Design a protein around this motif. Structure first.
Motif, mmCIF file in Angstrom:
data_model
loop_
_atom_site.group_PDB
_atom_site.id
_atom_site.type_symbol
_atom_site.label_atom_id
_atom_site.label_comp_id
_atom_site.label_asym_id
_atom_site.label_seq_id
_atom_site.Cartn_x
_atom_site.Cartn_y
_atom_site.Cartn_z
ATOM 1 N N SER A 30 0.811 -1.204 0.000
ATOM 2 C CA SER A 30 0.000 0.000 0.000
ATOM 3 C C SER A 30 0.847 1.258 0.000
ATOM 4 O O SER A 30 0.528 2.229 0.690
ATOM 5 N N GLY A 31 1.922 1.244 -0.778
ATOM 6 C CA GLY A 31 2.801 2.396 -0.841
ATOM 7 C C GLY A 31 3.656 2.383 -2.088
ATOM 8 O O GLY A 31 3.763 1.369 -2.757
ATOM 9 N N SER A 32 4.261 3.520 -2.397
ATOM 10 C CA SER A 32 5.122 3.689 -3.568
ATOM 11 C C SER A 32 5.603 5.118 -3.408
ATOM 12 O O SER A 32 4.824 5.992 -3.029
ATOM 13 N N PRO A 33 6.876 5.383 -3.719
ATOM 14 C CA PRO A 33 7.485 6.702 -3.596
ATOM 15 C C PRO A 33 6.800 7.808 -4.346
ATOM 16 O O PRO A 33 6.806 8.943 -3.907
ATOM 17 N N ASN A 34 6.164 7.462 -5.454
ATOM 18 C CA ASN A 34 5.501 8.441 -6.299
ATOM 19 C C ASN A 34 4.110 8.866 -5.824
ATOM 20 O O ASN A 34 3.270 9.318 -6.625
ATOM 21 N N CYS A 35 3.859 8.749 -4.526
ATOM 22 C CA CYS A 35 2.566 9.130 -4.003
ATOM 23 C C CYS A 35 2.453 10.589 -3.642
ATOM 24 O O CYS A 35 3.360 11.147 -3.023
ATOM 25 N N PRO A 36 1.287 11.193 -3.925
ATOM 26 C CA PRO A 36 0.971 12.600 -3.672
ATOM 27 C C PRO A 36 1.415 13.041 -2.306
ATOM 28 O O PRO A 36 2.093 14.041 -2.151
ATOM 29 N N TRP A 37 1.086 12.219 -1.326
ATOM 30 C CA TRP A 37 1.397 12.494 0.060
ATOM 31 C C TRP A 37 2.796 12.148 0.476
ATOM 32 O O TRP A 37 3.245 12.602 1.517
ATOM 33 N N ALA A 38 3.472 11.311 -0.300
ATOM 34 C CA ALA A 38 4.812 10.876 0.062
ATOM 35 C C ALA A 38 5.958 11.821 -0.207
ATOM 36 O O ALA A 38 7.048 11.594 0.287
#
Ligand SMILES: [Hg+2]
Ligand SMILES: [Hg+2]
Ligand SMILES: [Hg+2]
Ligand SMILES: [Hg+2]
Lengths: 527, 527
Positions: free
Chosen positions: A223-231
């Protein structure tokens, strides 16, 4: 001598913890960086000066200062994620659960906790790798890292408080694991870093960052990936939030040094109290101090990297959960309530979409609404509720992950994607939230195994399947020892991770993610 | 004396045509306007100077000059729509099928033919109202009007060639019907004007135009509505096309008068040959000379009118067909062919979307593609084919009609909406085109009745149901004499018009039309 281990850092006296039908070596609280207290607050972590005499590693380390979550006092569903040890800035310590008899060299699995970079504890109950290390003969080490301002305040110019510091803590945790895991029976050249939410995003931010690419072998991103809006946030945005936090705590913002000096004087709590006062927009699934794109840790925009294939090519096992957004709506979107079916009204659905897509202009919100609204029942409480559970889900976790998976797969050495769609029968959260973001962990960490937490036998099964998928992958780089399809840009196969016979599907939430990853941003740029 | 009728215009000697098991009075070719030949080309129609001596109304009138359709020579499917009498500019004549024995005063039904304003004949076989007038005891009169440049050249400034002239021809046809239909047994205060495609759009442009609102009682709009993309152009655009046609026929475009003089000299054919050379964009479902928004016939933008409820409030029975766009793709979109399943490739699907939405900028096309593409099978020939059959269908006929129906319903005295989803079992066109635009007419005109055209008995039934729905509506203003629901903005009920038990549905292609009528244009304005 089994429990006592000598490492390059020093001798560490572990403890033997009982697990399932047996016992297991557990070395809890091994320091990996000098306590980031004092005038080192915000400053990068210094390695841990070699100690002398056995380091008693028998009791969980403190948890970094973080925003506790009083939104549902005593309610497991929320409390299970709150720091369960005395918070302290002196929290940079890793934990190692080593099989018994200690392996000579087995797979190593480093866990990076989630919590949108503002919270996280490596000591949480569902993070207790005793069952994973045991059941899967793997040496599991769960690190800890500075969360919130303490680890992510990004006054770019300065060095006294450059961003991604907490991301560096993870690297230091990974570096130590690389240099000493052998003494624990771990194969340093077979270290798989896995994490969820921000952890699944951190793991990914190591696959990108040149500095980290060498400190691990594979990556599992849940449920994650570096390219996330919040990340991530631009160096400027992080600076802004840095001066804003400064403003909230009433600091002399005349210069990074005066600001930083001020912030370094505020007690941990002074920062945690006002740390939410700095988001630039009323929103959902957005956190204040999060990894800044500095050009040092991250050479360029994660997209430019992802595009140019400028990342560590290895095999990654990543996935998302059916209902990623539920938890964030229930906490920051109106109309949702833990105790009600939260049948969001239309007037509130649009309040949801505003919070989910805080960057979207009216047209943006319009396009989002167009895709998620039933239009043949545009008032259905349920439909509106679930619709948001997807706007927030897809937009924040599924779509950016589908991007990273696709962009990475065109260069990596194998991708295995899952779709965890299973509501733990013993969940305490409302049924409407469904398969909640962060609720696959208790499975990945074999919790269903312990009968005391009472999961249906069918789930214990799922747990073991998941842990084996994870372990077998950490070892071989393939989750398989029916066949869990490789993810290929051509076919895009992925599997459901539930108690039902593992079925294969293709193109996770494609219609939506095309709009999210291709149309929406294109719209937003034009308008 | 039954066949010989005296009217304010003059005595007209009709003919007795056989119909079904009987015979019927038929007065074909009654002039209603002075032949728009000579220096009256483009000029508004002058009423027909009263003749003396019986006007032999026993043989169909000529058909206005129009673009014949050689795209499939001898192929009924195409030929059935081509002028079947000697084309002539002297074509402004109406036809009246009067029951036998002649009623004293019964419902009158005026038919306005379709053909995107560039073609149309009141003499076509499927327009032969003998079966409708007979089976439904209604006096049916089908008028004719100048189509193409001849009736729609809009050099706004000038009076020698102001637009909507052909729209005026319809008014003149309607005026005469108002003044003389009584002599035929028609109730002038119960004249229902019905039309399809451009006819269904003309009818609607009379419900709007103040000048016409009084010349009829109700309106039946089939696969048409005045607010259609193709149904109108700004005075400027019409001027542009007027000078462009002028350019194509190599005219002195130095002034409206010189241009007009030039055009008035070109034989009918000179105009028809190059009339397609003036569209401003490579497209589909777009016609050159179409009603111009002059401010005279149309007081303001049909939207401003529709918005302000500035239109004749009455009951209208309107509807659309399942596959509106098929016919236009098959003729102007690549990949479609009469003889093949036309499984449009993706590379061509996007060529389709370009042609369908000729105004849309890249983002526009992107948004359209996003809505119509399967994304979980974005290469399926069929899916792409049908997808276009909808982009063209919804965009051009369904959505603008859903707009007009909704905007009108908030002021009119009743709306009855149908969805004709029935492929005439004896159709000659490819099965993929499905329920084709313009193929409900043969039903509305009771063709299934004649066994020689061999329709399944079940369709003869449908025909009679449709004709009764039409007639009963023309008389009472309600299609009913099960219940065909009224269309209300709240519930939006409409019915399927097929051989199956008339079911009720709500909100015709709503998800799409919201995008078409609300989002797309909003996007286009912003970008
Ligand atoms: Hg992510
Ligand atoms: Hg296993
Ligand atoms: Hg229309
Ligand atoms: Hg009838």
């Amino acid at each position: 001598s089994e429990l006592l281990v000598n490492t390059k850092s020093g001798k560490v006296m572990g403890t033997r913890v009982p697990v399932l039908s047996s016992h297991i070596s557990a070395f809890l609280g091994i320091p990996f960086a000098e306590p980031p207290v004092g005038n080192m607050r915000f400053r990068r972590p210094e390695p841990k000066k070699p100690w002398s005499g056995v380091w008693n590693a028998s009791t969980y380390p403190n948890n970094c200062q973080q925003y506790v979550d009083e939104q549902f006092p005593g309610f497991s569903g929320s409390e299970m994620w709150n720091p369960n040890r005395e918070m302290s800035e002196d929290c940079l310590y890793l934990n190692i659960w080593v099989p018994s008899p200690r392996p000579k060299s087995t797979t190593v699995m480093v866990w990076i906790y989630g919590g949108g970079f503002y919270s996280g504890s490596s000591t949480l109950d569902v993070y207790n790798g005793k069952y994973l290390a045991y059941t899967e003969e793997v040496v599991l080490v769960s690190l800890s890292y500075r969360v919130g301002a303490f680890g992510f305040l990004a006054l770019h110019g300065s060095q006294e408080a450059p961003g991604n510091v907490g991301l560096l803590d993870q690297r230091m945790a990974l570096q130590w694991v690389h240099d000493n895991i052998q003494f624990f029976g771990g194969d340093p050249k077979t270290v798989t870093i896995f994490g969820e939410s921000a952890g699944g995003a951190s793991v990914g931010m190591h696959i990108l960052s040149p500095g980290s690419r060498d400190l691990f072998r594979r990556a599992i991103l849940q449920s994650g990936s570096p390219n996330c809006p919040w990340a991530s946030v631009s160096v400027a945005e992080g600076r802004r939030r840095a001066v804003e936090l400064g403003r909230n705590l009433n600091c002399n913002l005349n210069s990074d040094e005066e600001l930083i000096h001020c912030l370094r004087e505020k007690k941990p709590q002074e920062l945690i109290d006002v740390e939410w006062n700095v988001l630039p927009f009323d929103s959902i699934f957005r956190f204040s101090f999060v990894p800044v794109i500095d050009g040092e840790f991250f050479p360029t925009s994660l997209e430019s990297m992802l595009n140019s294939g400028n990342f560590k090519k290895t095999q990654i096992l990543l996935g998302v959960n059916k209902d990623e957004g539920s938890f964030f709506l229930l906490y920051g979107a109106p109309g949702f309530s833990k105790d009600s079916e939260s049948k969001i009204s239309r007037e509130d659905f649009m309040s949801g979409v505003k919070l989910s897509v805080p960057h979207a202009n009216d047209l943006g919100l319009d396009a989002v609404t167009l895709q998620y609204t039933d239009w043949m029942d545009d008032n259905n409480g349920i439909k509106n509720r679930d619709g948001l559970d997807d706007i927030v889900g897809d937009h924040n976790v599924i779509c950016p992950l589908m991007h990273f998976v696709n962009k990475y797969t065109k260069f990596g050495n194998g991708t295995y994607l899952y779709f965890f769609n299973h509501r733990a029968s013993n969940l305490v959260w409302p049924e409407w939230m469904g398969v909640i973001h962060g609720y696959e962990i208790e499975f990945v960490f074999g919790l269903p195994l312990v009968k005391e937490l009472n999961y249906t036998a069918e789930e214990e099964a799922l747990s073991r399947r998941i842990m084996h998928y994870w372990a077998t992958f950490a070892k071989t780089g393939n989750p398989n020892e029916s066949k869990w399809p490789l993810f290929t840009t051509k076919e895009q196969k992925f599997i459901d991770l539930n108690t039902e016979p593992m079925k294969v599907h293709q193109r996770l939430r494609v219609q939506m993610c095309v709009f999210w990853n291709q149309f929406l941003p294109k719209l937003l740029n034009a308008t």
